[PDB]
């Protein structure tokens, strides 16, 4: 029920920083949806785009 | 020859069990088709029990003892071969739930009623 990004008012993702994406990806490799994250709607799409570019860049794994 | 993987295919039609070297060299394998369960009797957990325990008993002639097992695909053999391998006396470290789910893959066959 708490949105992390509005909680500290952080702006756009800056995809190079990764450790938050680490705890936004499941341990088997999929994205945690809003049912468990509870983020705001307009940030979830830039989140999933960010972890997608991370996956293409091979810092975050497709499967684990 | 002390460890390796157990590969078990559970299907709606048949249950397969295979032991192999850690780098993939197979020693022994079994299935309900091997033990004579023919038709759709190959899908019962009891035949999964029997095939798994007889493959574990065929593992002894090269003498592996500790094991990790990969369960493959859905069906009643998902847990039956697991309990059979654990009750067979051979040490199992953990089970792995890997499924060959793609992202999309090719389209499946036609919807099997019409």
């Amino acid at each position: 029920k708490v949105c992390y990004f509005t909680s500290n008012g952080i702006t756009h993702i800056d995809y190079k920083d990764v450790d938050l994406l680490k705890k936004f990806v499941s341990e088997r490799g999929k994205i945690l949806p809003r049912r468990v994250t509870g983020t705001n709607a307009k940030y979830q799409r830039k989140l999933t785009a960010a972890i997608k570019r991370a996956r293409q860049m091979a810092l975050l794994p497709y499967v684990s | 020859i002390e460890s390796g993987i157990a590969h078990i295919r559970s299907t709606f039609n048949n249950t397969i069990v295979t032991i192999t070297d850690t780098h993939g060299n197979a020693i022994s394998w079994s299935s309900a088709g091997a033990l004579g369960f023919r038709g759709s009797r190959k899908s019962t957990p009891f035949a999964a029990q029997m095939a798994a325990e007889t493959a574990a008993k065929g593992s002894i002639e090269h003498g592996l003892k500790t094991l990790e097992v990969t369960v493959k695909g859905p069906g009643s053999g998902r847990e039956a071969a697991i309990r059979a391998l654990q009750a067979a006396g051979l040490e199992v470290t953990a089970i792995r739930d890997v499924t060959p789910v793609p992202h999309n893959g090719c389209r499946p066959p036609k919807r099997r009623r019409v």
């Binding site: - | 369960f37 038709g39 759709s40 019962t44 009891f46 035949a47």
Partner: protein, 149 residues
């Protein structure tokens, strides 16, 4: 609907050894009283002569050797008519064992009924009866189809 069970023809309550129990009552599934009990007593005796030991002892040893533990029932699921085995309740066990005892007692075909039942008592005390045969038959076929449940 509703499971019911009931006592029938039990003997006197106190000091009921099974020999006096089936001496005064019990088994008697041949028809009516008279030419059902007399004959049973004669069969019971012609085996004391044969083996000089306790008739009721060898009788329940015969019953024990007849006792099954598995019985199969059929099912309509699937177009192949699978059959499923279940554990037999003890009352069903004793009545069914006694049923096969009496039916191949009358089926086994000797010159008269008392020696027929006498030879059946011997051939069920030892494991060479037709009832012992069918006992192992259903036992092994239940073990064959035991995979279903």
């Amino acid at each position: 609907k509703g499971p019911v069970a009931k006592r029938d023809v039990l003997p006197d309550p106190i000091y009921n050894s099974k020999l006096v129990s089936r001496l005064i009552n019990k088994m008697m599934i041949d028809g009516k009283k008279g030419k059902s009990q007399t004959i049973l007593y004669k069969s019971f005796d012609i085996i004391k002569e044969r083996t000089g030991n306790d008739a009721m002892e060898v009788f329940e040893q015969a019953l024990k050797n007849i006792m099954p533990v598995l019985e199969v029932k059929a099912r309509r699921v699937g177009g192949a008519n699978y059959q499923v085995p279940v554990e037999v309740r003890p009352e069903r066990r004793t009545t069914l064992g006694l049923r096969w005892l009496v039916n191949y007692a009358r089926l086994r075909g000797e010159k008269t009924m008392e020696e027929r039942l006498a030879n059946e008592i011997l051939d069920a005390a030892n494991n060479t009866g037709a009832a012992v045969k069918k006992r192992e038959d259903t036992h092994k076929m239940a073990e064959a189809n035991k995979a279903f449940a």
